[PDB]
Structures are given as C-alpha cells and as structure tokens.
Design a protein around this ligand. Structure first.
Ligand code: ATP
Ligand code: MG
Length: 126
C-alpha cells in the first residue's frame, strides 16, 4: 500500500477543483507525501504543484482506498480546502477546472470520490 494526500478544494462560488488524469478520469488533486512531510502539508503541496492554486486547509476529511491499474493499493488521505484562481493543468493534463456540485457529480469517475464530495460539501461553511 502506498499513501497519498489530496484536497477537495472549493472557491468562493462553492465550485470544486477537479482534474482529468492520464487515463481520462476526473478526480481531485492528490499525490505522494515526501519524506518527513505530514499528509496535510503533502496535500497542500500536491494541489499547488498540479494546479498552481494556493489553498488553505479548513479541516481533515477521511481516507479513501482502492487498487490502481498497476496493482498498487493506495490509501489517500483527504483534506477540505479553500482556494481561488484559474487552474493551470500540469504536463500530465488533458483537463482541469472548477465545477459546481452538480457538474462534479456528473464528472467524478469513482464512488469513493462522489461520496467524498458530498461529505465535503456538508462541512464547507458558508
Ligand atoms: N477510487 C478509485 N477506485 C478505483 N480506481 C481508481 C480510484 N481512483 C483512481 N483510480 C484508478 O487509478 C488511477 C490512479 O492511480 P494512482 O493515484 O496510484 O496513480 P497516479 O495518481 O496517476 O500516479 P502516481 O500515484 O504513481 O503518482 C486512475 O488513473 C484510475 O484508473
Ligand atoms: Mg508527488
């Protein structure tokens, strides 16, 4: 199992930051923690690296698990975040943008992410 850390990021319009990976799936931004890095710090770094968005962690969410196409089981720890700015897709792109809850429900490719989206929306203050 390999750890992961990501963020469910929201802007003022309460839109969520989504990315389209190599295999064509829309997901939340996340990546591998660096040695000595906490998951929260790792999550903030991964968001900035992959989208150029500077975000603030509001509170922790919960981890999701799954086995990727390479046979590696991943445990990704998530954090609710706040951020702004036009996303800048990284050279591992194909897609990115801010989406409303309803649009995100139609893009997110996995059950774990759809579930995570709702729980995040509920804890996101007004
Ligand atoms: N919740 C999920 N359930 C099932 N499959 C998923 C889930 N999330 C992602 N995947 C699949 O696994 C892939 C992502 O795996 P993973 O996060 O390990 O790789 P990565 O982020 O592309 O690269 P890396 O982790 O090596 O830096 C997706 O491209 C997709 O095919
Ligand atoms: Mg990384």
């Amino acid at each position: 199992m390999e750890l992961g850390a990501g963020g469910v990021v929201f802007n003022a319009k309460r839109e969520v930051l989504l990315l389209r990976d190599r295999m064509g799936f829309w997901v939340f931004p996340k990546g591998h923690p660096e040695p000595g890095e906490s998951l929260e710090e790792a999550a903030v770094r991964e968001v900035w690296e992959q989208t150029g968005v500077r975000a603030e962690v509001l509170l922790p969410l919960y981890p999701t698990r799954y086995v990727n196409p390479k046979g590696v089981e991943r445990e990704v720890h998530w954090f609710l975040m706040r951020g702004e700015g036009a996303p800048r897709l990284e050279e591992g792109m194909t897609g990115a943008g801010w989406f409303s809850p309803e649009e995100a429900r139609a893009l997110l490719a996995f059950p774990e992410d759809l579930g995570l989206l709702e729980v995040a929306l509920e804890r996101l203050p007004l």
